């Protein structure tokens, strides 16, 4: 097994360390685990995109618990258990106080836990996803909780970049990825997570907001700590700017995040805000001509329409590409056992 | 070695055309999908009474996106996918403004696209289910919009009655079928849509009405124009009743609808219609039929809402199956 | 077949059970007790040992549960799961909304078409009943307000039978002493348990504050039951108001404020002791007492998993039975 035709990955040796992992946080993701889930990842992508048979986890059961309205995040999940061949108990449109009827997180986890193989958990508090893992005797996906913890969306973000540049794995001195992340760098949690993953690489940040809402000196040191521990920390190595034109100059990578109205004192300010920092064609004419453009999504006015038609921008490939990393986290954790022949090969 | 009563159906040749094909109108079905449809229907009928292996359809993955409550509909779909061996994630119990949150459809229907084979959608929005078809990298088979477009509905309705009188296939000017649409005409869009399908072969339409809920002029000169292609039209094809004595004499069959005291169908007002008479209702009920009627043997309407499960099979089957063998097809 | 004692015709009783309604605890006999007992105890080790427990395929179910009873749904679903079935649900909705002016008889008769069998929860008793009688394919009472809970029952039953065997035998030497604490007077989960238990040789203390007492409509069904087994006497069914009391020299305690499960409480116990709880807790047991060897609500609320396959297998199999 290879990835980037460069780096040898024994599938077999790192399913044995991931077998019934639970993973709450990108940190739970080591190197040789990152390395799996891109060469894993990328077979289902040409598995599906060649119609070919997709079935490499049937004999599972799982529990989808979304404590919170993300459909998206929700479908992704339940499309990837599907279409590997495994079959999913659903718990949605419910919230915390209404799902836990006053019974434990502890009592509820420790009973689910005996009827499935694994849990997808969805819940705004982080609290509870932690007591979930400590309380289950079986594995967690963390598949979002406000803390900004979403390790998936993380992966998938990283899996988008590495496909396009893929030299951000090398970490080669010579050969650095430069990143803008645009809009709402205090609340895009999204930032704050891919940050974290792509400052263990060879990577210079431009952060484009508008003071109120810059990124937080927490996310700052751990991108500096981290670029340091790898000797790439320079004082070019994280630039600030508060518009587009200086922000999106020799960037291999635009991430934008949503800028939300509810985040506001009014919607003078959000107006004022979102429309500064508005994705154009014209924006876009003085990039480079690799550049490509990352959303998590859902986008709102952050970029117009006309942007879907520019070949730079992937946001839609990124959100398909979420099946595929979502397919491969799961098969890579929850796989029965490992033999070479049985793991997935285009 | 594929034939409807007396019709041999080249369903590799009709599959071919039907593949990835999305089923948003009744019109998007032409005559020999319409007999595919059928046969497939029936040999679905005959493999589920016969407790016959059902799996013709495995490996594919749907999304049914329901934004309005339709249970009965969703069940019978999700039903389908279940019984082919195929699998399903499920959006329900959400409206229009609370599952796009704002997105577009069009960005929803992109991003849906890309996880599944195919979308069943039902939104009473019109707009929505043509723009999630234009935004939609897979099929999509509407289980129901506010123009009142419902194909399944339409063709489960005509499988049935088809099921009673197969002339109805024949366009013999000699066999003509006779049915009468008793309650609101004006609402009751699964009269707008089978009548346009019913329109196609040699059919006589008694509309029996209130006032207020008629026919619309719309639905009447479409049966005409349809009438007119293959030579079926008279002054006798379309006629008007305000009472069932009148409606429901000579009518092969009498399909009710969801009137919202005078159009209740009881054993009385039966006694005065033909033998062969099989009675529809698309359903649920409330007093449009009594209780009563359940135990006439002319009463279909239970039969019919269970045909929903072989049609939607059927229609399943024929869009998204990635075959190439006529050995492979149900054939029991 | 056996049970290391009892040999069970499981193909004499599949044919018996097959498209049978389970509403009531009393529409299980015997045979069909033993052989919910033998199956979902094959389900247990074939589970546990990471075995393939694909032996119902090939069914569709539906799951309609019209009141919030997540753990018991999930336990379903799980179930069907497992078994390699599919399931389409109908959850988060109510009585009112669900029927939305239309009749539970055209519901059922419809919906009955569409699938193999249903899973119905319901809090009405009136609703299961029409749904029984309107379907033409087998329901599985989930809980209605009536009290009827058949697979708590039986998954309770398959707790007691795992550490007590002998329960089975009707031994008038070898009797089971149980105690049940809290309520009740509403906790329906012990009348129901109380009507099975009775089947066999058993010693019932009913330990509540008087307001809340067993029902004597349970206690007039425990002393038929006992009676026509012939293990009835003035000691088969004592009351109590207090633990200390109502704990001692009973093999099973089921829980359901001096009525609060401690280790201290449980110091006085027998040594084989073990403590059922349905689920879910909120002071009744203390979670120093999930440390206590004698602690079994987790296995039971497990068990249900087993439970649940095997009555899914007997019902809707059409037949390479479970083994080993
Ligand atoms: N909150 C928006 C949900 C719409 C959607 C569902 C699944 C996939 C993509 C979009
Ligand atoms: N709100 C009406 C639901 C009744 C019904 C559910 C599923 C199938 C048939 C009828
Ligand atoms: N009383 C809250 C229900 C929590 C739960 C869900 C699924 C399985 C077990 C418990
Ligand atoms: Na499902």
Redesign the interface.
Known sequence: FYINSKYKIDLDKIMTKMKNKSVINIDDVDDEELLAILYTSKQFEKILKN?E?S?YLE?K?F?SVFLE?S??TR??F??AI??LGS?????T??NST??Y???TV???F???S???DGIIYRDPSKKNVDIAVSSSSKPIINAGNGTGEHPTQSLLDFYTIHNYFPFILDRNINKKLNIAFVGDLKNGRTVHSLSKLLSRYNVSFNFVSCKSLNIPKDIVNTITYNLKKNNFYSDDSIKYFDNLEEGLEDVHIIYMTRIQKERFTDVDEYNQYKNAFILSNKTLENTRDDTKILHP????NEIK?EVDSNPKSVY?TQ??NG?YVRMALLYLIFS?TSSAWSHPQF
């Open positions: 119609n048979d079935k004999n059961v529990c309205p459909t998206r479908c992704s339940d499309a599907l279409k079959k999913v108990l659903n718990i449109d419910m209404s799902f009827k006053g019974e502890e009592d509820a420790k009973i689910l005996t009827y499935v999504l859902p986008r709102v329409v839609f959100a398909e099946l029965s």
